[PDB]
């Protein structure tokens, strides 16, 4: 019964909507979308998708102010300035912020000035903004938080299994590297950008760039403060990525024992969040997986009894979006005013 | 000898600079560049290129207002609004307009307001603007023209051999299709765009889109008005494109006679503009060619004695830029004021 | 009810299996497969596919001589020489020849020697072999034919609408060009090949190459003998292709009249074979379509009243395979011995 | 004055020839090539290259038994069976084995039965075959070795800087991962292969596969026996790769100190073998670098004083080939019988 609004109808915004549509007995009601591109555009791009394929639902425009999905009508507005949105007039409870532009209190707060009661950022928050990762620390959320963050795709892949390792072996220190698919922040052909590396043609290069997933894990898992670091390598694939972690543990072990620890959690406290694959698969095989992290068992190695190396896959668009849905579900169940 | 300013340091802007740098005894002198990205950005992207390779010349930043190439210094400015540019102050003779946004008389004229003397648009002009194609109708240029156009890359490939075909056999009617490399106007991943086809992931699809080259040919070749039309298909390659033309002629002929007609021109009036290749090559082999169009002789066909089909290659970035330098040299040699 | 054997478990071989599996009440029964790669390899590549996605059915290896799909068991054999195959022993009725090496009577006949009853080649036959295209001339099939051909993917896309155009307007002459996805006959990196163009890196170039579809059309449509010719351009996409046809007709017409003629057929005699699309889509949107050809109505053009240009899409892997299943059903319904 | 023969004219074979051609005062003389593809093919693919570009030399066929480069004539033969090659008759001193098929004594020995005096394998040798890496242990080579190995591209990138780290900090143990461009061993489209992962479409996936560079380093650097391991990830780029190493050292240090150690060696004992780059570059920027390893300084990290992480680039085709040339040069200088 929570009235939800989506601000920014891009890759995550559209993946969010399709993820929600597939749920059963949802406590959420999507009633409005702010797409600065218009009604025709919103309808066309929701129906046709180069990554997910054609949406199996009857999608069409409704007048010049809305669209409909299998009969359910959804209002569409268009304004680049949040302060002018009709949130108060419509009675919006929660705003899904997926523009990538209003990631700080100053910006996200504009939605509050317009009347919305709460805001959820689909990315790391800038400054003193509460950050949560489902399966790791969501129990710390309270109805008093007016603005929250669901972290990044990379942090949602790491956090889960890093927690299992620290509790069953004790992490002393480590480092990680992620081979990530390209995103809209990169350039199609060599062009201007703050990051001189992200300025180079994306379908043609291996592009190194910084990452904050390192210290982001420390936020959701206090024990790991100042114990990890890392970088990222952007490659020529449209979706699906992988993380490579190497850590030093206090408890001597062996590869076969580490995989056992993972399978146990995936079957209990992390069922639906973590998974373990024992087949020789490739990136494309992990498209549309609802979990946020999948361990590639055959690649697990242990050198010198204490140096562990782990490899895990993750659908950065779809898997992350299922998590945004879960967090929004928590906001609903904890609502009191 | 002629003061030249470059407005817009993108793909065409940077290619133009390198094309000019390699010329011997040039009547042009580039003294300033307007890069709304920064002195270092212009410096970095000029030295390193994903398509042309590393620039063979010592490139460096000369302070916070200029850069250095093989010693020479070139000022760098940043201002999205042309009316406020120091053109009149620097005594600029010609401005190379390559931003892709100021194509009409009002927009382009703003350079004249800033104090510039003449403007040359690296794209099709809108409205009442004289268009020229070297080798087709450049002889009709006059120093009196304050604003001119060099047409599109596709038009520069078509015009040259269409002219030969009309003079030798007489064109009645025809149609065209260009399989073109992707450009900056397209999107890396499904995203908002006025053209619902160009909005789709460029490195993943074959994308049909409109083209104006057909009607543009009639501009430089009046006898062809109303005789041609066509379309374009954008594909997953970063540079180099190909044209496929089918026309019905008044004089019966055959494949080898058509090829020979093209060779006579390439050896005479169109030397340096048109070429004929007899080897079995592919697109990558035509990168960095100086001509505007190259006929693939073994693909030429004639059906029913009067329906001719021709296939021609062209480097849309480097080939077109060499023609920009050529048209600029004509302006310099025609200065009588 | 009909014993079918699959010789060659490649792209076409595996697509055929999945196409058949989805049919309702099939008169065919696949009992054996000849994969010179192994029982597990056939098992692994059948379940996981980079183009079709994960097969939705429980696939498993049934020993060292067969596999299991949704319970059913299918024998697996390995023998590069057909003459030594247990066809006669298993009482095989029809053999689906999809290796691409046995296309003539001698080569294909070896299946008859092994004891097979009939053979159907998933490619153009060489010499004196009857060729059929569903929707064009399948009515001319007879149980007496021991060896038949289903033509190429391009021919199956062209024939259907060329037939409509000839009956309605009368074709005098024409030319064609197909922008086709790359296939297994090409090379990943520059390497030895009889065709010096197909020897070049496939994911990096636009590659011109010969095609036989033009002359092949005359086989199924005798009235077109000597009226068409054409070429092909291979581009960097893994599947889905498009045809561009230009013809001169005897009866004057216009674009919308041509489109309407195609719609009448799609709604009647060619339902399930030909379709007409009025939306602004791209290649990825046509993946997994069951028809042989789809007209892109907004691209149709007519120059000088009698020169018609048509653009049509086709899934070269999945679309063609559905036609293989259709021709196999005809053989089953025509069995009179 | 060493008479050399090249067996297998693929990517490495052709890169080898162009590398040699560019040297000054070479002690080698290439007189014959075994290309099972023929004279026309050998001439065409040497002249045109999708990665290196057009060879700046006059290349053509000479009769039907040879080719010429800038006037120098080179004989061409074609036979898949080494025992039948005219090595003894021609007086061949050294054979460059780049087929990827005769990597063991049994196979490579066939060249010795045919008359050649020595053989050099352009890949890791199988079994008890002497292995060398220029800049690390070439001083151990002696004229008595009849068959030798130059190791793999990955080992030539690692070995060099691993040596600098162990001598100035002391390596206790470590692990590595290499993000490598695809090669001819992979499949263009999902097809049969021993490695079920290498069987999947290469321009479309991130493909994990095993590597032997781990224990290969121990061969050229005894101190590191049983101290390292690792894996590989194949991505959608045509050439140029990168290595990521993480090791535990006995001497506490910091990132800035590690880079200093590298710059020192690159300027002395490893000049021409190792390099250090301090700019924000991308993969394409390292094409055609003659060194075998380039450290990306800005990416160097140190966690907990003793856990070091290093990132280095390498042109797997060209850089490796320059090393094959150097090793062959050593064979010449140490020749005595
Ligand atoms: N892709 C992924 O893997 C993940 C992305 N994210 C984060 O989500 C955010 C968006 O990323 P993503 O969906 O990937 O990218 P997209 O560019 O696909 O989506 C961003 C959208 O914001 C729209 N937009 C920008 N400003 C406005 C505005 N002021 N008003 C209305 N619409 C606006 C853009 O429209 P326009 O087309 O005009 O640019 C674009 O459609 C970023 O914060 C990103 O870091 C987080 C996790 C995963
Ligand atoms: N690429 C090709 O093959 C050809 C392109 N053209 C034409 O050339 C033009 C540009 O195309 P292209 O080089 O491909 O594109 P690019 O985006 O590479 O270059 C255009 C540049 O204009 C800059 N820019 C935009 N507005 C301004 C402004 N108002 N003031 C200063 N700088 C500005 C843009 O900066 P920013 O990035 O900040 O937006 C961008 O750098 C178009 O007219 C195009 O049709 C013609 C022939 C060939
Ligand atoms: N791909 C497409 O779009 C279409 C292809 N076709 C045609 O179908 C045929 C095959 O093409 P395609 O599926 O694309 O190619 P694939 O290589 O994917 O399939 C061909 C298969 O034949 C197997 N094979 C070869 N010889 C034998 C043999 N003697 N005995 C047993 N198995 C053998 C090959 O095995 P191995 O890998 O060991 O060499 C390979 O697996 C060709 O005639 C092609 O023109 C027709 C329509 C569409
Ligand atoms: N590419 C790289 O990065 C490196 C490769 N290597 C090694 O070098 C070897 C070749 O690799 P690469 O050049 O990359 O691959 P290629 O396939 O490009 O080269 C191998 C060549 O061997 C030819 N060939 C195979 N058998 C014979 C034969 N019996 N007689 C004559 N010619 C034959 C093949 O011809 P055909 O076309 O008929 O297949 C092919 O042209 C392998 O051992 C590989 O591991 C080592 C370092 C680097």
Break chain C into its structural domains and give their ranges: 2-151+317-336, 152-316
> Cα separation of A222 and A234, whole Å?
29
Return the ligand 3 atom nearest residue C9 CA.
41
Looking at residue C126, the DSSP 8-state letter turns out to be B
Active site residue D153: yes
Report which of A151, A149, A140 is spatially closest to residue A105, judged by C-alpha positions: A149
Residues 6+ apart with CB under 8 A from B252: B305, B306
Tell me the ligand closest to C11's alpha carbon: 3
Residues 6+ apart with CB under 8 A from D56: none
Chain A partners within 8 Å of B182 (Cβ): 188-189
What positions of C carry a catalytic annotation? Answer: 153
Looking at residue A198, the DSSP 8-state letter turns out to be T
Burial (CB count within 10 angstroms: exposed 0-12, middle 13-18, buried 19+), residue D244: buried
> Cα separation of C72 and C21, whole Å?
11
Inter-chain residue contact C236 with B233, CB threshold 8 Å:
no
On whether D11 is known to bind a ligand per the annotation, the reply is yes
> Cα separation of C290 and C287, whole Å?
9
Q: Report which protein residue has its CA nearest ligand 4's atom 27.
A: D99
Q: Which of C36, C243, C327 to mutate to test the pocket of ligand 3 (most atoms within 8 A of CB)?
A: C36
User: Is the distance from the beta carbon of residue A238 to the nearest atom of ligand 1 less than 6 Å?
Assistant: no
Inter-chain residue contact A205 with D175, CB threshold 8 Å:
no
Alpha-carbon gap: C186 to the closest alpha carbon of chain B (Å): 13
> Cα separation of C150 and A224, whole Å?
64
For residue D15 the two structure tokens come to 């890169």
User: How far is ligand 3, taken at its centre, from the CA of residue C9, in Å?
Assistant: 7
On whether D212 is known to bind a ligand per the annotation, the reply is yes
Chain A contact residues (CB < 8 Å to D):
172-175, 177, 179, 196-197, 200-201, 204-208, 227-229, 231, 233, 235-237, 240, 242, 244, 246, 248, 280-284, 296, 299, 301, 303-304, 307, 309, 311
Q: E strands of chain B, at which residues?
A: 2-7, 28-34, 59-61, 66-69, 72-77, 94-97, 118-121, 147-149, 171-181, 207-209, 228-235, 241-249, 274-277, 293-296, 301-303, 307-314
Residue C166 neighbours by CB distance under 10 Å: 18
Torsions phi, psi for D204 (to 5 deg):
-115, -5
Output the CA torsion sign for B62, B68, B73, B78.
negative
> Cα separation of C147 and C117, whole Å?
9
- Maximum Cα–Cα distance across chain C: 67
Nearest CA in chain C to D198: C45
Q: E strands of B117-157, at which residues?
A: 118-121, 147-149
Chain B partners within 8 Å of A49 (Cβ): 190
> Cα separation of C206 and B182, whole Å?
13
Radius of gyration (Cα) for chain D, nearest Å? 20
> Cα separation of C74 and C67, whole Å?
5
Chain A contact residues (CB < 8 Å to B):
10-11, 35-37, 40-41, 44-45, 48-51, 182-184, 186-192, 196, 199-205, 236, 238
Query: Contact at 8 Å (CB) between B239 and B182?
Result: no
Burial (CB count within 10 angstroms: exposed 0-12, middle 13-18, buried 19+), residue B184: middle
Query: Contact at 8 Å (CB) between C211 and C158?
Result: no
Identify how the structure was determined.
X-ray
Nearest CA in chain A to D228: A303
Q: Which among C208, C280, C304 is the nearest to B172, CB-wise?
A: C304
DSSP string, D264-307: HHHTTTTBTTEEEE-S---GGGGTT-SSSEEEEGGG-EEETTTE
Alpha-carbon gap: B26 to the closest alpha carbon of chain D (Å): 26
Beta bridge partners of C194: none
Alpha-carbon gap: C203 to the closest alpha carbon of chain D (Å): 7
Return the ligand 2 atom nearest residue A189 CA.
18
What value, to the nearest 5°, has the Cα angle with vertex B314 and ends B311 and B316? 140
| Residue positions forming the annotated binding site of C | 11-12, 35, 80, 152-154, 183, 198, 211-212, 234, 316
Q: Report which protein residue has its CA nearest ligand 2's atom 25.
A: B99
Burial (CB count within 10 angstroms: exposed 0-12, middle 13-18, buried 19+), residue D35: buried
Chain D partners within 8 Å of A177 (Cβ): 177, 244
> Cα separation of A261 and A263, whole Å?
6
> Cα separation of A71 and A57, whole Å?
10
Query: Does domain C152-316 sit in CATH 3.30.360.10?
Result: yes
For residue A48 the two structure tokens come to 């046709």
> Cα separation of B236 and C41, whole Å?
31
Return the ligand 3 atom nearest residue C183 CA.
1
Looking at residue D261, the DSSP 8-state letter turns out to be H
Give the resolution value in Å.
Answer: 2.1
DSSP string, C179-227: EEE--TTS-SSS---SSTTTTS-TTT--EEE---HHHHHHHH-GGGTTS
Q: What is the domain class of D2-151+317-336 according to CATH?
A: alpha beta
Which SS3 state, helix, strand or coil, does residue C28 take?
strand
Q: SS in 3 state form for A110-177? A: HHHHCCCCEEEECCCCECCCCECCCCCCHHHCCCCCCEEECCCHHHHHHHHHHHHHHHHCCEEEEEEE
**Cα separation values, C56 from A58, A283, C17, C62, Å:** 24, 18, 13, 18
B311: enclosing H helix or E strand: strand B307-314
> Cα separation of B249 and B306, whole Å?
6
Chain D contact residues (CB < 8 Å to C):
10-11, 35-37, 40-41, 44-45, 48-51, 182-184, 186-192, 196, 199-205, 236, 238
Strands D118-121 vs D94-97: parallel, antiparallel or unpaired: parallel
Q: Which of C5, C6, C8, C153 to mutate to test the pocket of ligand 3 (most atoms within 8 A of CB)?
A: C8
Domains A2-151+317-336 and A152-316 share a fold: no
Looking at residue C272, the DSSP 8-state letter turns out to be T
Q: Testing the interface with D: which of A182, A208, A234, A252 to mutate, by most D Cβ within 10 A?
A: A208
Residues comprising chain D, all counted: 337
């Amino acid at each position: 019964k929570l009235k939800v609004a989506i601000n920014g109808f891009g890759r995550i915004g559209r993946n969010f909507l399709r993820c929600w549509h597939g749920r059963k007995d949802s406590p959420l009601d999507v009633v409005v979308i702010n797409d600065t591109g218009g009604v025709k555009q919103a309808s066309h791009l929701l129906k046709y998708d180069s990554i997910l394929g054609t949406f199996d639902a009857d999608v069409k425009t409704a007048g010049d102010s809305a669209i409909s999905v299998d009969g359910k009508v959804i209002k569409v507005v268009s304004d680049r300035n949040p302060v002018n949105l009709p949130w108060g007039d419509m009675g919006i409870d929660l705003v899904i912020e997926g523009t990538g532009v209003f990631v700080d209190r100053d910006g996200a707060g504009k939605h509050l000035q317009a009347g919305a009661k709460k805001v959820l950022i689909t990315a790391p928050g800038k400054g003193d903004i509460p950050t949560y990762v489902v399966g790791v620390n969501e129990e710390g959320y309270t109805h008093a938080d007016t603005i929250i963050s669901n972290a990044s795709c990379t942090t949602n892949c790491l956090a889960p299994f890093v927690k299992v390792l620290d509790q069953k072996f004790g992490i002393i220190k480590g480092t990680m590297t992620t081979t990530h698919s390209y995103t809209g922040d990169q350039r199609l052909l060599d062009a201007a950008h703050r990051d001189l590396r992200r300025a180079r043609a994306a379908c043609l290069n291996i592009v190194p760039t910084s990452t904050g997933a390192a210290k982001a894990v420390a936020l959701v898992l206090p024990n790991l403060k100042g114990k990890l670091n890392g970088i990222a390598l952007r490659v020529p694939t449209p979706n699906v990525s992988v993380v490579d972690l190497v850590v030093q543990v206090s408890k001597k072990t062996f590869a076969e024992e580490v995989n056992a620890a993972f399978r146990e959690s995936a079957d209990n406290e992390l069922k639906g969040i973590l998974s373990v694959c024992d087949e020789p698969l490739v990136s494309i095989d992990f498209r549309c997986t609802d979990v946020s992290s999948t361990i590639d068992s055959s690649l697990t190695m242990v050198m010198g009894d204490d140096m562990v190396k782990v490899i895990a896959w993750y659908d950065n668009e779809w898997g992350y979006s299922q998590r945004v849905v879960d967090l929004a579900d928590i906001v609903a169940n904890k609502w009191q005013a």
